[PDB]
Design a protein around this ligand. Sequence first.
Ligand SMILES: [Mg+2]
Ligand SMILES: [Mg+2]
Ligand SMILES: [Mg+2]
Ligand SMILES: [Mg+2]
Ligand SMILES: [Mg+2]
Ligand SMILES: [Zn+2]
Lengths: 130, 52, 45, 243, 47, 78, 132
Amino acid sequence: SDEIVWQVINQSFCSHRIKAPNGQNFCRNEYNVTGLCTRQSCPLANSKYATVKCDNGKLYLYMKTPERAHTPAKLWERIKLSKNYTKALQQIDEHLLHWSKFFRHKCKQRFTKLTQVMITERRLALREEE
Amino acid sequence: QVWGSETVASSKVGYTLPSHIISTSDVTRIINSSEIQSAIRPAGQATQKRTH
Amino acid sequence: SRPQVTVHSLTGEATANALPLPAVFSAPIRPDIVHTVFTSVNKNK
Amino acid sequence: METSNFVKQLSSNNRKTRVNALEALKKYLTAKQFKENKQIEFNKLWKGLYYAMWFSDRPRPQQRLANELGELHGLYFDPKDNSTADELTTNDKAFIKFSRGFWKVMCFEWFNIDRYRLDKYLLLIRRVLFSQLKYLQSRNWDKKLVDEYIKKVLRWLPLSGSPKVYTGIPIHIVDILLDEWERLLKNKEEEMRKIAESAKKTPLADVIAIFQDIVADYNNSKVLREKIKEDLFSDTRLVSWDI
Amino acid sequence: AEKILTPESQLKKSKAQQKTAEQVAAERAARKAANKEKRAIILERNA
Amino acid sequence: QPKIGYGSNKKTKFLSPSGHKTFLVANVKDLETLTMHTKTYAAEIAHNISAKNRVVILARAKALGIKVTNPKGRLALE
Amino acid sequence: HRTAPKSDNVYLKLLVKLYTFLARRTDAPFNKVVLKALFLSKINRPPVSVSRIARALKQEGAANKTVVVVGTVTDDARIFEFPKTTVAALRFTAGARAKIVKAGGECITLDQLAVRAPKGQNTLILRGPRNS
RNA sequence: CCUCGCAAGAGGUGCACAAUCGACCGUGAGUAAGAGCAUAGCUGUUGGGAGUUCCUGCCGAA
Ligand SMILES: [Mg+2]
Ligand SMILES: [Mg+2]
Ligand SMILES: [Mg+2]
Ligand SMILES: [Mg+2]
Ligand SMILES: [Mg+2]
Ligand SMILES: [Zn+2]
């Protein structure tokens, strides 16, 4: 049913979709790795999916499988990426072993950017402590 | 009882649930399959090489 | 395309009893027909 | 009565219920009453097991559960039955009904599986073939067992070539079978000698004749016939095993 | 703990792609030889 | 006289001289949709946003490293 | 004529996608023919009754062929004896479906036929009379 | 669509429909294996009293 769901979401109301002036579309979905409404992008469209998303200081990895499509409360499995960037990429590749290259590449890029953002918000909010 | 099942009358006079034009919702499963790829000729590059 | 659904008690605890899915949920999901019928019926009020 | 309960428990959202259904199945399967049952109970049980696989979460649990489904075939073996007589035992007939139900249910549900959900079931078919052949090895390939297994199980639907059978299952088994026999039989120089000798012991040359017949028939699909002819007849191990 | 196993579809795809690549390489070699012979024929016709 | 022949190249269409496509932003959640596309896109705070919200949007944008097309608007003039 | 079905039906579009892919990637002209048929309007998709299926099978050597109708199949009470075959078509009326099931035949969607016969082997396409 | 053929072809089989050839019913609208009904959209004509035309593009007589 993923194709049907995607086609309805495409030619009907993807509520998280925002139509930019260029004509490109952006899904507002927080779990979305690539914030662009496409076949590979909407977590709604695709049963198999993954994302790096920041919670507190941690940069967790969220996993989505067709097996837990029912029971959406427990759908997203939460994995802690190690603070070491190399270890984090290794863990992402391991968990995303035998996993389509699109989500893996996008997940790695999102982890890099979130790490940079965490570094730079530490920068902007440096305090006298320590 | 209100709408009916495979072997149960819908309780609406002369009503049956609609049939599916396509038996499978997901076209990716069907297009991939196992036998089609045996039937299919080798693929192209998917990004045409510019000639001339 | 599950076989059955699990009833849930009001307090929240999952109930052992399970009910098979009806045949309605395995029916065509047609945005176009729903859209046309919805426009026609919403014009009434 | 119990069979319906097992089918329901297997098709339960709670993981614990699904696991406990399978654990109790391991005990229920090795009983006289199950043997007495008709093929329809077998088919219902296989539907329940199929849905149990349908709910498996992650690839490692999927491997574990495919191994468990193989073990289910592995259970229906008595060392005594092999020794007593060459003629097949009623336990073995029950095992043949078990395999029949498996392949009927898999043929039925093959088409409804999702794209992402199909990969686990390919592994399941692999492990089921492994366990079914391991049963023949444990029985030492009795002629009666082999004949009735081929005619009742493999000839019925996996290798029937009928239009009803989805062609993907034939391509899948022909990919599986070559590696599966090698799995049963277990440097490369001496390893090949051991494999060759144990292959001479095995009846696989009997099995390949079915694919030969399928390739012979005109009514069968050209896609299936062509792939089988290209994969098997051109294979090297058949030459190595003089087949 | 236990190692993950390759998907059973990716293995089929790898087999098919390997066979296709071998076929394409053979066709390429034959095409190269045919091109040389074709150039010889063209030279003769032009003369 | 306007006509289709004057149409701009697709690769350069809808591009500011800074090289960033303008994307309207209302709140922090809509800002976060442009987290990595900092090179391709630049945010533009909507006209109807209150001054109290604009400073929060600017702070979050600086943290994310996304270029804002109209900062110091309603916090400064022109 | 058309390059895509004027209908906005999701499932017809899915079938068109599958069949255009097969026609692109299959040498057999069957996929091309069915792809072009899928675009046709209602007037250009006349109903092919179970009656015509019976005649098409009575033709010599076609008894075991898979009859294909890009469109709908309608029942015909005029007949008493109907042979067993695995008709394939877009839609099946309740009468036609009951007749096919009763006589040991079976009805499949065009996707199931594509899985069966990606090159259209042993297929027999039929088209209804478009008198008006 | 099936076989043979690397291919051109050799055939086999034949949807719709056409071509002529005829039978029967009653010389055609013929039969000898029907498609229509309903809804909605666009839209041609007949009508009942009954100047220019937001921007761009497209197809195009004489
Ligand atoms: Mg590519
Ligand atoms: Mg390939
Ligand atoms: Mg203003
Ligand atoms: Mg009409
Ligand atoms: Mg004739
Ligand atoms: Zn979307």
